[PDB]
């Protein structure tokens, strides 16, 4: 067990060690920060162990050692919080606040906070059912015409899961020396790697490694594959393509080219068509590869 005197001595030792490390690395001890400590300890004690926690670490004793309870009452004996005797002062204080916000309104891409990190925020163990009750209150608050402060309060209890699955990244339109607008993109299928350049205006001329596509791809199926992206958005005969592919085989090269042309063509179609191409599987790298 770690007595408070032990933690105090550890804090003093860490401060002196921080000043020593700043002396060693030539940096000013005053502005020396934890990122600087991490960089310096990575330089001085190089360790490529895969486990980041098995590497040398110089952290504040507060961070590295566990924590303890807080005092809930002073020497007079009176608890600080008015909901102390419930035994769940933090949770019920939060519920009380939410109910007051709902009363005020009644007078007038992301994920819900999960139970364990709610416990961390409240610093109180709570059951499943009371977690559900809190989440139902939060949902009820969201449904109402919540204001700015209310939306911030709700944002306190919602982390991110990312909404970018909606949106594929659109390449920027570049200009060649002739003044023709084009867009470049890359794709990969098995070991085949392709880079395509799609010109805004064209007549459907596709050049693979400086060769016409029907001569590079004798098999009809590969030409079907190259046709798929433009055909999907009804833009056959409206672009010129200059692609370079390397590695893989016949079908892997065809698929890599198809992905590269789809990603490059994303620049010249509407956002709705970008989403449609995404839902058709035309913008997703195929990860299926040979297993060991």
């Amino acid at each position: 067990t770690y007595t408070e005197d032990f933690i105090k001595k550890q804090i003093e030792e860490f401060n002196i060690g921080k000043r020593h490390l700043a002396n060693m690395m030539g940096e000013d001890p005053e502005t020396f920060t934890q990122e600087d400590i991490d960089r310096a300890i990575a330089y001085l004690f190089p360790s490529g162990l895969f486990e980041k926690r098995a590497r040398p670490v110089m952290k504040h004793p507060e961070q590295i050692f566990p924590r303890q309870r807080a005092i809930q009452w002073g020497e007079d004996g009176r608890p600080f919080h008015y909901l102390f005797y419930t035994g769940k002062q933090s949770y019920y204080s939060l519920m009380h606040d939410v109910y007051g916000m709902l009363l005020n309104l009644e007078k007038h891409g992301s994920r819900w906070l999960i139970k364990e990190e709610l416990e961390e925020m409240l610093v109180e163990k709570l059951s499943d059912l009371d977690y559900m009750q809190f989440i139902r209150l939060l949902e009820k608050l969201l449904t109402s015409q919540c204001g700015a402060a209310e939306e911030e309060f709700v944002q306190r209890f919602r982390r991110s899961v990312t909404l970018e699955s909606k949106k594929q990244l659109i390449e920027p339109v570049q200009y060649d020396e002739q003044g023709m607008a084009f867009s470049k993109s890359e794709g990969k299928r098995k070991t085949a790697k392709a880079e395509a350049i799609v010109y805004k205006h064209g007549s459907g001329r596709i050049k693979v490694n400086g060769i016409d596509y029907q001569l590079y791809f004798p098999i009809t199926q590969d030409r079907e594959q190259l046709m798929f992206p433009f055909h999907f958005v009804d833009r056959l005969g409206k672009h010129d393509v200059t692609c370079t592919v390397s590695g893989g085989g016949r079908s892997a090269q065809a698929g890599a080219i198809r992905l590269a042309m789809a990603k490059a063509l994303c620049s010249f179609v509407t956002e709705d068509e970008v989403e449609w191409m995404r839902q058709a599987g035309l913008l997703t790298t195929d990860p299926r590869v040979r297993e060991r």
Binding site: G109, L163, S165, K166, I219, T220, Q221, E224, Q225, M227, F228, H231, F232, S251, A254, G255, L259, E275, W276, R278, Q279, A280, G281, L282, T284, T285, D286, P287, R288, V289
Partner: protein, 206 residues
Amino acid sequence: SRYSPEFKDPLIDKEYYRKPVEELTEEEKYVRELKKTQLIKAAPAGKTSSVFEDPVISKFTNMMMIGGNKVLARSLMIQTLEAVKRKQFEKYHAASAEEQATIERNPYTIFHQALKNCEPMIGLVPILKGGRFYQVPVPLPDRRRRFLAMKWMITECRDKKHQRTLMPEKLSHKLLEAFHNQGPVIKRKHDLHKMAEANRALAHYR
């Protein structure tokens, strides 16, 4: 599988997306909105938005394939279609004025109708309960009979009594016989529907 459970299979249908927002119902609107969040698998080599795509012929080609040789399988399928088309044109030019209205020259129509004429409606299931195997009848799912038509056609065309007749010519002849409700495959369907009628009492065992 290298795809996680989140990934969903893509929808290659080109006319689905062009459907107007006005025609969308609330349910279909919700499905469309939901799909936006979801991760989609890369479309596989094969199906395409091409207007000539035929899933039935693609499956037949995949079932003729041996050892991953899809180029040869597709070559055989296209040769079979060409042979069917040429035989129908030959039969059409030698026909009277009135007989030319009832000669089909579209090979895809003939192929689909031939595979429809070979589908068994009912089948048999080996079930040994009393120490003796009992073949009980069962009605087949649509997928099962659709598969059985193709499997019987391919097995019939691979039979070794057909000696040095190349695959496209055998397959076209079998398809044109099955188009007119003739040939050994229609007989195999009938002799299954008869062995499933001669055991209509064993159904209760199921």
